[PDB]
Amino acid sequence: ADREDDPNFFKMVEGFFDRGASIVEDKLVEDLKTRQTQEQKRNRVRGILRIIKPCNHVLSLSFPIRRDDGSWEVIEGYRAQHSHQRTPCKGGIRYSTDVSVDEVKALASLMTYKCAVVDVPFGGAKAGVKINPKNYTDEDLEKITRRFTMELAKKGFIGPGVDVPAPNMSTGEREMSWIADTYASTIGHYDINAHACVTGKPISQGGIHGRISATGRGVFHGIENFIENASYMSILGMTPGFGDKTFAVQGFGNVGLHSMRYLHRFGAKCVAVGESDGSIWNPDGIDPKELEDFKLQHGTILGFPKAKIYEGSILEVDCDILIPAASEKQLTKSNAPRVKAKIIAEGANGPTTPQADKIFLERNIMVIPDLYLNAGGVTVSYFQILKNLNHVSYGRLTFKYERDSNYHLLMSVQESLERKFGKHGGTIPIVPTAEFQDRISGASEKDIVHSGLAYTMERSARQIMRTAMKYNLGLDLRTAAYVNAIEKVFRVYNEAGVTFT
Amino acid sequence: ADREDDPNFFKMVEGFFDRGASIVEDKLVEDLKTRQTQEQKRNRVRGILRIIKPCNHVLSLSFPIRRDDGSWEVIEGYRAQHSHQRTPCKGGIRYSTDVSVDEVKALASLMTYKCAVVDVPFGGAKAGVKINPKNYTDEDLEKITRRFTMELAKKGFIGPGVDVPAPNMSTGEREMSWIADTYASTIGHYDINAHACVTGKPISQGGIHGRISATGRGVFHGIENFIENASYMSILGMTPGFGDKTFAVQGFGNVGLHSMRYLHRFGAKCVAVGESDGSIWNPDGIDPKELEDFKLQHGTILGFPKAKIYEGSILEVDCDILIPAASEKQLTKSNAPRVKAKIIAEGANGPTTPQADKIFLERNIMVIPDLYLNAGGVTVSYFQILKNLNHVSYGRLTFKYERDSNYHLLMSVQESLERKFGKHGGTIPIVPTAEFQDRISGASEKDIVHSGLAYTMERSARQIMRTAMKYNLGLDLRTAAYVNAIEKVFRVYNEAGVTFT
Amino acid sequence: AGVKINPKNYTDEDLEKITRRFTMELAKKGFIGPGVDVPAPNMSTGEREMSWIADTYASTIGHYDINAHACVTGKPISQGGIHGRISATGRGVFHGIENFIENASYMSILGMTPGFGDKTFAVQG
Amino acid sequence: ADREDDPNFFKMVEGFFDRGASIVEDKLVEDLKTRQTQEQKRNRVRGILRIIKPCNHVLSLSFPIRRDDGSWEVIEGYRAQHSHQRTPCKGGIRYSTDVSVDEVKALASLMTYKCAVVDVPFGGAKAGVKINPKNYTDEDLEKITRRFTMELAKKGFIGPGVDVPAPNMSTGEREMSWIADTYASTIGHYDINAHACVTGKPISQGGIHGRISATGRGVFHGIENFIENASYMSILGMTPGFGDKTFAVQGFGNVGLHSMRYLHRFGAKCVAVGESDGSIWNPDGIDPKELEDFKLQHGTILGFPKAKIYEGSILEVDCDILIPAASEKQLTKSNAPRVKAKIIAEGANGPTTPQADKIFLERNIMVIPDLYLNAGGVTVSYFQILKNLNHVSYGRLTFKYERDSNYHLLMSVQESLERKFGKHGGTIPIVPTAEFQDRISGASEKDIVHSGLAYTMERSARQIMRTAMKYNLGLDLRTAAYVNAIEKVFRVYNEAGVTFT
Ligand SMILES: NC(=O)c1ccc[n+]([C@@H]2O[C@H](COP(=O)([O-])OP(=O)(O)OC[C@H]3O[C@@H](n4cnc5c(N)ncnc54)[C@H](O)[C@@H]3O)[C@@H](O)[C@H]2O)c1
Ligand SMILES: NC(=O)c1ccc[n+]([C@@H]2O[C@H](COP(=O)([O-])OP(=O)(O)OC[C@H]3O[C@@H](n4cnc5c(N)ncnc54)[C@H](O)[C@@H]3O)[C@@H](O)[C@H]2O)c1
Ligand SMILES: NC(=O)c1ccc[n+]([C@@H]2O[C@H](COP(=O)([O-])OP(=O)(O)OC[C@H]3O[C@@H](n4cnc5c(N)ncnc54)[C@H](O)[C@@H]3O)[C@@H](O)[C@H]2O)c1
Ligand SMILES: NC(=O)c1ccc[n+]([C@@H]2O[C@H](COP(=O)([O-])OP(=O)(O)OC[C@H]3O[C@@H](n4cnc5c(N)ncnc54)[C@H](O)[C@@H]3O)[C@@H](O)[C@H]2O)c1
Ligand SMILES: NC(=O)c1ccc[n+]([C@@H]2O[C@H](COP(=O)([O-])OP(=O)(O)OC[C@H]3O[C@@H](n4cnc5c(N)ncnc54)[C@H](O)[C@@H]3O)[C@@H](O)[C@H]2O)c1
Ligand SMILES: NC(=O)c1ccc[n+]([C@@H]2O[C@H](COP(=O)([O-])OP(=O)(O)OC[C@H]3O[C@@H](n4cnc5c(N)ncnc54)[C@H](O)[C@@H]3O)[C@@H](O)[C@H]2O)c1
Ligand SMILES: O=C(O)CCC(=O)C(=O)O
Ligand SMILES: O=C(O)CCC(=O)C(=O)O
Numbered sequence A, B, D: 001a002d003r004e005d006d007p008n009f010f011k012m013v014e015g016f017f018d019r020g021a022s023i024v025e026d027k028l029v030e031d032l033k034t035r036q037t038q039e040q041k042r043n044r045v046r047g048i049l050r051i052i053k054p055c056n057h058v059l060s061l062s063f064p065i066r067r068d069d070g071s072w073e074v075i076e077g078y079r080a081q082h083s084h085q086r087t088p089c090k091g092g093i094r095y096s097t098d099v100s101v102d103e104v105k106a107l108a109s110l111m112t113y114k115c116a117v118v119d120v121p122f123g124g125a126k127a128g129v130k131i132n133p134k135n136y137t138d139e140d141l142e143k144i145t146r147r148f149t150m151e152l153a154k155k156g157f158i159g160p161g162v163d164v165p166a167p168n169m170s171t172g173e174r175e176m177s178w179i180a181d182t183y184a185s186t187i188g189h190y191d192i193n194a195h196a197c198v199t200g201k202p203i204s205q206g207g208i209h210g211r212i213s214a215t216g217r218g219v220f221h222g223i224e225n226f227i228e229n230a231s232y233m234s235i236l237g238m239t240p241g242f243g244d245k246t247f248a249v250q251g252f253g254n255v256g257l258h259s260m261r262y263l264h265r266f267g268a269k270c271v272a273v274g275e276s277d278g279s280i281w282n283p284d285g286i287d288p289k290e291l292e293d294f295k296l297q298h299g300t301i302l303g304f305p306k307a308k309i310y311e312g313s314i315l316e317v318d319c320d321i322l323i324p325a326a327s328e329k330q331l332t333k334s335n336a337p338r339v340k341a342k343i344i345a346e347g348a349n350g351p352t353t354p355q356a357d358k359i360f361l362e363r364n365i366m367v368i369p370d371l372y373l374n375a376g377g378v379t380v381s382y383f384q385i386l387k388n389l390n391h392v393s394y395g396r397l398t399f400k401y402e403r404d405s406n407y408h409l410l411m412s413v414q415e416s417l418e419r420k421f422g423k424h425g426g427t428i429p430i431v432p433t434a435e436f437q438d439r440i441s442g443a444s445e446k447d448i449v450h451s452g453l454a455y456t457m458e459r460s461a462r463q464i465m466r467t468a469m470k471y472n473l474g475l476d477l478r479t480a481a482y483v484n485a486i487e488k489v490f491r492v493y494n495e496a497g498v499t500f501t
Numbered sequence C: 001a002g003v004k005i006n007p008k009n010y011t012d013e014d015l016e017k018i019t020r021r022f023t024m025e026l027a028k029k030g031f032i033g034p035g036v037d038v039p040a041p042n043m044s045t046g047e048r049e050m051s052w053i054a055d056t057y058a059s060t061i062g063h064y065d066i067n068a069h070a071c072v073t074g075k076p077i078s079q080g081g082i083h084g085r086i087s088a089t090g091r092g093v094f095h096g097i098e099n100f101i102e103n104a105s106y107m108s109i110l111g112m113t114p115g116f117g118d119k120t121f122a123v124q125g
């Protein structure tokens, strides 16, 4: 409720898109070489960006579920499929009373540009049931999410080839298991890819190792790629490395917890934690496990044995990095001017407002765009659909060959050496180091996920920097990202003849 | 723009639904006999009506079309499917810049209760592209409506068995022809019912005689059933019959024109005609043909050689019957108190506001609900889907048998008589009257449509009256109608176990 | 078709779950649908379960079937039933008898008279 | 016909399932952490195992085929799909007059637990036509199996994504070719995976190298993993290795022949061979090729030039290992007490009865469960579906890159060494050994199959041992296996919310 400065979530993201469209329009028109034209090229380049902004299809459901206590109850649901330029649209299903067609619509677009930035071949999409998961019983929720899967199913809003839902606020591997089981037992009964209809599902259901921690681990990698490039941190008037840094995370949920888990592991210090109901603050730092354990057995962090119940704005906390990890539009124009963190790690979707951005730019703050920072979720989710398609857990088929061959390879150099340096050399044993030893069988699903996310995160980062440079965005990483997210999403459209009218 | 009194179209209709739900709730709970209960019956009866109110599925599209002059253009579209209690949902596709998700949502619900009232087995639905048909070329429009049909097609929002679109504001047999041709040449290529995906289509494309005039002819029948029942017209402090009456129609479009065509034919006098751009008023009456011809060659009625360009509120015109035949919510609280017409023939969807209704009740005015009055469109549209399913034009198979047999039947009584009254009787020729002669081959498609609409319109009327009586609604025909539209739409839900949770 | 339960042991809701779930199972193997197999009532099943069956079939597979509701018969009137289905088998049993109880020839071997009017009967179940 | 002790095949396997369910129930309830409960956890854990035991869907066909000599003939067929917890159910199609709904039902369940044990992601299933392949002409058989494929096809009992048939008794790559050709020329005409509907098909039809020998090679690997772990063989009061061992195989068919082929290759001695019609016994050992060749040109082993027609119980033969490789329930309570073999290699499905098991336990005999031992067929069959999905024969895309790169790698260490040890070193050629040489291009389809089966077989073995230990099963390998096959098959169910009621 930011009074002046509580913008329409879809138009906001739409706007962010627009600023990048500015820094690029020309070059789009430029590279564009379509013969007969002048700046007709421009208008073309101009129509396309207009065609990109809006959501293609948005479905609004309303369906009954019989509450445990007899009572019938109509429920609201939405699934916006922003783009198809890449087909399987992807996006999480948010369970919160705060959902709405515009909220989901934006959350959807953020998915399409997000995937662009990180090179994950999906269009964007987003779902949202309008309930408060804490009011329904665990069984009400099954009925609701199983029924919601059926409804989306019969209108083209879910399935391995059209739209692939995943987790978000108040949804996790549980509902992803429910969704997959009613889809695969219903429509996909004959689909060889029946279970790739959703991602973020449990391991026993076809999940992949590292999806729970994925977004956090990505938030972590997002930061590192930037917290270790002096140049940037110098403008930050800070040092390189988490090791001497400090951070405070808003929301202690999926991305929140794990983001804190990873930063902590790399020496960063978590001085504060914000939650729907309250804050915490131990300057001597809080321990991600301890805190999580407490949260686990208290359904709350409030009253953590080792930190005073802080009362203020968790966002206003004094710490090098603030990582918003909950609802959108939190760092608004009315609090931006005092967030006092050098780095804003946008782990949540759309946490900072255009106005707040402006301030951050002025206050000279680096806000790593959610549009790149939380791309760690779709990447690993991509490695899950990929997995599902492959029908094999990584390694199972090669491990042995991989190992045997590897030993032979070494043994080649060995004998090679012995044969020359004969009997004096006598025996020159060639042995894999500790490290290589634990790699002698090749990568496993866990290796691929981690190593993979790491490569994609680091790549999209440099991708963002070059752009930030070429255009002097400086610490305006976002619109540099949009610039990217715009020419990829543009190259597809343009080269497709746009539309069959 | 009715300042105080320009209500949310969906909540308005929702409300109308609610008042009827009041006059019935009890009896619903009553008839309801489900064993174990008390007034649990009530809560049940209460959940169901809650489950009925909202739209099941609503799809919001946005798609590009390349305007004739190169320019790319994103377009807005919606298709709300209010209910499925009866499967093929039905509703027209409105082309107006005034469309919106809520407008369509309401227009959709009005379809489901409307069909209930007139016993046409379809759930309600409504479509709306957001354009002003006068700005696009005739070809822009094909591209738009053919492209819109494709989009709705791939999400379950059109097809002989799910949703069957039809005409509405700024759409007619032309676009209905376009829709059917891209549906049947695309998805329905193998559908034996490929062409029943839409109704209101041209005759050469599988239309039915009387669909263009259907809604008007229905508006006419709606009035007669009420303008000839002294009792009502007595409260009206009026006489029985159109013959000595006078009326003024708003909007000179599909329902408008033809409504005027039919009333005129039955002696009623059309003193005024309102149009988007202007009014007309000849007290000596205007001629529906003359006026139409002029409109045809002038794309306007303005400046009709035989009537002075009236300037006022066509709705405020002094005439026995006012027939709103255009955009919704026109007789608002701010003009209701001076409409000066004894009968309000709601040919348009939702023209009178709850407040205006109240006034009309007070001023003691009879507003025949659109919820029954314009049901003439869905009825004949129902006779078109029915036709399409049958794959035969009415009569073709029987006409001859029908005729031959008929002559034999008469010739039986003939000989029967002669045989007794022998030679004196000598020859007693039995011959069909003029009338029977033109019925000797049995009904034709035109007979069925007309005779059929006539029967359904007159039936739903008496159905409305009995209800108006049983509950003392008096001249509050609407909520009597909702009372009907509610227990049919209720009987289905309840007896279906409601929902698979 | 035959489910192996005793309807008097399950609650009225157990039964919905069972028959709705049974309709889904038959559905995905070709054992129900307007064009392959059309279930109807029998012992311990009636217009109620026929309503349940039709609603999970038509809300599931037959969502696009123009004949989604002909997947089952014997369903309630509000669901697409027909007048006389409940009484149908009985009325047929009646007509079956008459056609035979009024043809002396047969009833003569029966050493009986023509007509129900002077007859007497006992029904099991 | 084991008089007392000829159990209902489905209940038998059901029982085996039950004993494992005992040794685990607790821990299932244990690990299970679902909040609100007590030993409610138990009941839950108890319902699930009840839900697992029975077959989901079982289809019973009867269809005509016109016997070559005019005569019409009705045929019996069954296809039981035991589970879906993993979708593509898998199982062979048995052609024998001994098929029956219960036989197939059991054979089906054995498939689901079998695949569990060896980590092959398929539910279990089994098919059975009721004919004696020796009575019909080779053409009768095509008609029958092509017609059977069509029937199963139209009821959901065959297809790349629901159920994938494979060989079994009296069916082989021939019928698997027939099945695939009528499926892919019929329903799967547009299926990109049309040919993965069946596995075990010929190479020219999309087979994989090693499927014929797969089950045998697996039986072999199954034994080795156990015949070389002193500890076990010590209780066996035997030595480690096939090299000094001796065995007798029942049934000289697919698994039979090849099992003998592989054991023989590793020094084991095949003293006897049993066949539907007769036994053989050369103590000096029989040669798998010789015997096969003779069988090939004599449609029988009876009268093998190098072994006396033995008359007794091939199962009662004096030999270290007895490998049942034919019909089920052969080592019953009435012959178990005198089988005189230290190791029972269950190559056939369900050859030993619970009673016989008990005896074997008492006599202190190790029966390696069919539930793990013949898993070599589904594994390679899994590598065939996998292959079919991939649409590429292993290696084709990488061989060259693989090789080139490999040589460069070596040449790196080479120059690396030379550069230091300069001109004295002068030339230190680094050359792949013989072994590495024949691996320089990376694995081929044959490498993957072999190396792959080897890894999976050896893994599931250790998996069985740890379990046999943790619970003191000792030489009761089976119920240790079920313990495994039960918590995997349990983890899926439980975490799926079980069922949408
Ligand atoms: N889970 C993913 O894979 C993923 C991927 C990308 C982006 N995200 C974003 O992360 C955010 C939340 O993470 P999640 O949804 O994965 O976890 P979650 O559903 O566990 O997150 C909710 C957590 O935030 C707390 N919370 C909610 N609103 C709060 C508020 N206003 N103040 C303080 N605490 C609040 C809740 O109590 C809870 O601990 C959202 O912005 C979502 O879009 C998640
Ligand atoms: N049909 C399903 O419900 C389902 C679920 C998951 C995975 N899959 C398939 O498997 C592939 C990746 O998963 P994965 O299982 O190959 O990899 P994985 O080895 O990463 O799977 C891990 C778990 O599954 C177990 N497992 C393997 N096969 C099993 C079986 N038949 N029964 C019970 N447990 C079994 C392993 O022992 C382990 O506990 C995907 O390509 C997909 O087609 C199917
Ligand atoms: N066509 C049908 O079958 C059908 C069926 C039921 C209800 N209706 C209702 O009838 C109404 C319009 O009839 P139509 O849509 O069939 O015909 P149409 O699309 O020809 O109607 C539009 C006509 O009204 C005029 N018009 C529009 N807005 C006006 C305004 N504010 N003032 C004066 N004139 C105006 C236009 O200039 C035009 O002559 C709508 O309320 C629609 O829901 C139509
Ligand atoms: N497939 C299509 O495009 C199409 C179009 C319209 C009607 N139909 C079918 O026909 C049925 C009702 O229409 P109908 O034509 O039977 O009734 P109808 O007799 O009311 O049709 C009137 C017009 O079609 C003409 N006509 C009939 N058959 C024709 C043909 N083969 N070619 C050209 N003109 C022909 C008549 O001479 C007349 O001008 C529906 O059941 C539907 O399946 C199909
Ligand atoms: N083929 C596979 O991939 C596979 C996989 C797993 C388990 N199995 C099991 O192996 C067994 C048979 O192997 P197969 O079916 O692959 O080969 P097959 O169909 O060639 O086997 C039949 C062989 O056993 C002989 N035979 C049949 N009944 C006999 C009896 N009672 N006594 C002596 N000889 C008899 C036949 O004459 C023939 O030589 C079955 O138990 C089957 O379930 C096979
Ligand atoms: N559509 C079919 O009937 C069919 C059959 C087998 C394999 N496949 C496809 O091929 C894949 C694995 O089989 P593969 O052939 O790639 O591997 P492969 O190289 O192991 O196949 C071996 C045999 O096919 C031959 N071969 C390859 N392409 C051929 C062609 N176009 N025509 C005739 N012979 C050809 C090789 O020379 C060799 O004799 C699968 O992914 C599947 O989609 C299709
Ligand atoms: O792609 C996924 O699996 C989840 C995407 C999502 O909601 C996010 O990245 O916020
Ligand atoms: O049912 C039809 O064909 C048209 C319905 C419609 O729009 C109306 O009755 O206003």
Ligand SMILES: O=C(O)CCC(=O)C(=O)O
Binding pocket: D090, D091, D092, D093, D165, D166, D167, D168, D199, D200, D349, D374, D375, D377, D378, D379, D381, D382
């Ligand atoms: O999975 C396969 O291909 C065959 C399975 C089978 O019948 C067995 O393992 O006995």
